[PDB]
Design a protein around this ligand. Sequence first.
Ligand code: ZN
Ligand code: ZN
Ligand code: ZN
Lengths: 97, 151, 94, 128, 150, 81, 93, 152
Amino acid sequence: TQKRRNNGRNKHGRGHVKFVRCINCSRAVPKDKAIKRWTIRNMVETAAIRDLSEASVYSEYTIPKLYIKLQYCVSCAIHSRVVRVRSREGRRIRTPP
Amino acid sequence: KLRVEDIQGKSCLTSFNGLSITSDKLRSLVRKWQTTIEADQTIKTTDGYLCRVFVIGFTRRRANQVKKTTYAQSSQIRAIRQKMFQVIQNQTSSCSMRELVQKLIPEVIGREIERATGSIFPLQNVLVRKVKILKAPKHDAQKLLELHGES
Amino acid sequence: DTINAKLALTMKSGKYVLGYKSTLKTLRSGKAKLILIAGNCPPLRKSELEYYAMLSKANVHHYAGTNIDLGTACGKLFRVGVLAITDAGDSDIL
Amino acid sequence: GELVFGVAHIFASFNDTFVHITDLTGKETIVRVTGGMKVKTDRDESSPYAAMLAAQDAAAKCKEVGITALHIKIRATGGTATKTPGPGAQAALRALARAGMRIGRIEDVTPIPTDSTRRKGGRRGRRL
Amino acid sequence: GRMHSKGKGIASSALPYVRSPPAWCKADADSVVEQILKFSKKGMSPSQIGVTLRDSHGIPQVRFITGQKIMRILKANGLAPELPEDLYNLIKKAVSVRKHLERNRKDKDSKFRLILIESRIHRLARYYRKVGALPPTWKYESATASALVA
Amino acid sequence: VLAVDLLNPSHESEMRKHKLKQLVQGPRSFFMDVKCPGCFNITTVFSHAQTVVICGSCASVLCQPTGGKARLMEGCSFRRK
Amino acid sequence: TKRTKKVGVTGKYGVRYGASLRRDVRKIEVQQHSRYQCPFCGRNTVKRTAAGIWCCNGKGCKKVLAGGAWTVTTAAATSARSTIRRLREMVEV
Amino acid sequence: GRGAPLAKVAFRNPYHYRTDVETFVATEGMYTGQFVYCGKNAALTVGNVLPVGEMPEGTIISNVEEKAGDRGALGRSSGNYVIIVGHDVDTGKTRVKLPSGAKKVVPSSARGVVGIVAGGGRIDKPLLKAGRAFHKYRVKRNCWPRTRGVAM
RNA sequence: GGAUAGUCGGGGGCAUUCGUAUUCAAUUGUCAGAGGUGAAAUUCUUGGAUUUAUUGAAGACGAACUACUGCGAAAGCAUUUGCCAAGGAUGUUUUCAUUAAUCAAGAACGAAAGUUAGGGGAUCGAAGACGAUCAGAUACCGUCGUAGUCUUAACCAUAAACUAUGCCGACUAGGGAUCGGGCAAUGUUUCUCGACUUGCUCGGCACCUUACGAGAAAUCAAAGUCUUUGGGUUCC
Ligand SMILES: [Zn+2]
Ligand SMILES: [Zn+2]
Ligand SMILES: [Zn+2]
């Protein structure tokens, strides 16, 4: 029974896709079949901005930030709750929440 | 990057050992739904210096563009990289390290390349991401002595 | 276009001769306007042919390709070392 | 104009944290303190509390040496690894700021690979 | 469908319903014939010359005026090539691919393309042999394909 | 819909259709006559000409072969018939 | 007639020396005794001699080429010539 | 007794009315009647002899001198070559990579022949019998065959 | 089918340029732990461990841009540049005129792993080596590490080699995105053309709704036009 029309991943007009590695476990996962998530974080805590401003120079200069991308396999994404099992009708909703 | 060259009475002189943009800036510049053009070139200045310069640019959305695509064809990318090449030679030919850096602080390369490449694609945020030196002269003792010593 | 094309136009309506002895005869006569030299030619022969064509005011073209490729473009089963075109005919090779 | 600047290469990993204070050049390191000697259980080496203690001990050592201003350079494992700052980097940075030392030029120097060699796991990962 | 491809392109030319020369085009049906003969004396392709009369000379489809095709006109006048145009062009392409293959020994894609061209040239040769446009003994040669093209 | 005059399609509908998909297929090109900006001769050129046309009098390039219609550069007036 | 399935030129060796060794000798022997094109003449009249000497027959291009033991040119020599040419062209300017 | 071919090259004596015939180690691609050039100002062409300090990095050479004037020591067997790894202008010395993988520093005046020693891959072919081994070492020395020590 | 014009493509081969990452080597500043795990344990480290600074070497690999996007008959193809051969679509009042579809047999290509040798061997890693683990672990876990992963020349011939869906031809409903081409805009913009937007059309990758229609249903624009059963043709 074909659960998903995509068969679990988006791939059309192609025969092979270069695989990548997971993060929590580092499993072999296809590039499209993986789960891509964005975690844009700051270099300090929300409560550490005041301490940094008191103990910084350069006239309260803008604190930088870190952009990193995470690739999760199916099992790790489900376990880490970044991706969860949905109902049959709700599976088709590809729009992010 | 500043390499220490000479030491003279509890004071060490430095020379330009290269420049690069920070990782935060580079990651902020690179984004999805756009095309990035990267070009490099090994250039020889007036004196015996070899420098590999790296320049990265990004295509610019016009304004009223509706599609979130704004890509560029491979032929257009090659033409832009050719534009990147001819402008680098033009702006570094008759320039020493003094004049090369002097054009480097205000991004003269970027300002004078966006106009040239505007006939192919708008482009934006064209910056010299890195420059690496490879061949330094023999300690440049007399040249550094003449250049420095003020105050 | 290409020299191979232009040679293709001249073979239907044009005067050309093959080989080294014949091209020397055409150059000595003076009716040879164009000479073509294969890439893998003897350098002494190339210098002699260039000297002959310089004296006879004929054009010299040492185009890319060995004598096998030249002969194949010439329409022959054998190897051709040098072409002497005395009349292009209806083409614009000259 | 009475500020002298050093460099703190804060190593951050999920298993341990390192506080490495040098001058403006990475050479001639003033202090090199790991988080494994402020606690003795071999389990909370990367804990924020242990990073708090290690960084403040380094801060006291730097203060007695005579180096107050510190440029900050956080670096994770990098390469083929998690590539995320450890839990102790934030605590170490907070302790350096709290101990009376000026913090400048926060930067990340995590080594990025251009699709480097394979990583351990054997195409199935660290299956648990 | 494409003979040796998955494409389904339908690009072609739609000949007009009219079968007469334009009003101003007083081609007089003989100056064009002389122009065609001159264009064939050099040895240009019948398709290429027909393009030249369509673009530069401004001549309509040559049949509507001369009453005969380009191939038929030159055949009647005697300037008939030894081989058909499509046959000669395919042999040229096959020869070029084999010359590239003998140099580049690690091009399996080019070898596959050569095999497709060899299949196409053989089928066309078989049709021409059946139709009688060529001598019955016209066995295509791989070693003397250079002879056949030129 | 369910009642369409296929024998006599709309003129606008035929225009917004492929040259082959019409009721009767036909060319969409045209032959035009061009005069040199500084001469008096006439030349017949094709809309989708593949080769560069050279005027017999003192003139520049008559047209530039593009993918579709040939580019016209010089200041000439063309008549379509 | 085919006259032989596998051994080819090696068939002079009979049943001895081992099949794998016989096949390895067969490939190299074919290369050693194969004709090659003369880059200066074009004729396929280049024969091996003394494992490194290659001579062209005929009344022309009587030169002797210094090549490999079994082939006129090897991959290492071709790559070396290519990189030498690239270095020369990049050092002339 | 040598796998690689040898090249007899005739030069012109710069001081006397005479010609000198040399015995270069043949480089692959060399032909009789070819013009070879030896000196500091020679071109980077296969078969020419140049100082190691006058050549770029990564070039493949053969018959390389360990010291300037010993007339060739390194990379002389068939199919072997030496790669110029780098240079050092101050106290001019060139770092090279030997066929065995060793890295050697030589003065930047030692001469080397651009190219690879002719003879290709000779050891790829099995000797296939004692007769070929006998004939190979007959023109070399009395070292074949060999009796095992445990058999004595 | 063959030309011809502008193209287009992460299509193929050869040469060639760049990138940091990993490991290793020298030297330098320093000393107590470093690694690892859920917790450990093994191993190495006051002889200078880990970390950090300079230089060099090795091979592997092209992150971010990387997309329900592109190319190739499939397997597969992602750094720059140059050369060679080729390919589809589009435009065309270009040429021949049935030259076409399907394939038993017959042949080319054919992931990864496996084989023969040469070169090369950084990381990972079959086999294997140790230490917790449960009653037994012998397997998962941590470190090391063999064949292997790279390339050259010869082999084979299979996988969930998948769209679990043979190929060619015709017809069949509504929408919006998307790649390539072409046509039109007294529309915007740019130091003669390019970028953006809109409309039409052809050729692809697809998506949402609906089910006249099909099915045992899941579902399907084909798996529809089939008890109202027959367009042509291979495999099973
Ligand atoms: Zn995982
Ligand atoms: Zn004109
Ligand atoms: Zn010869």
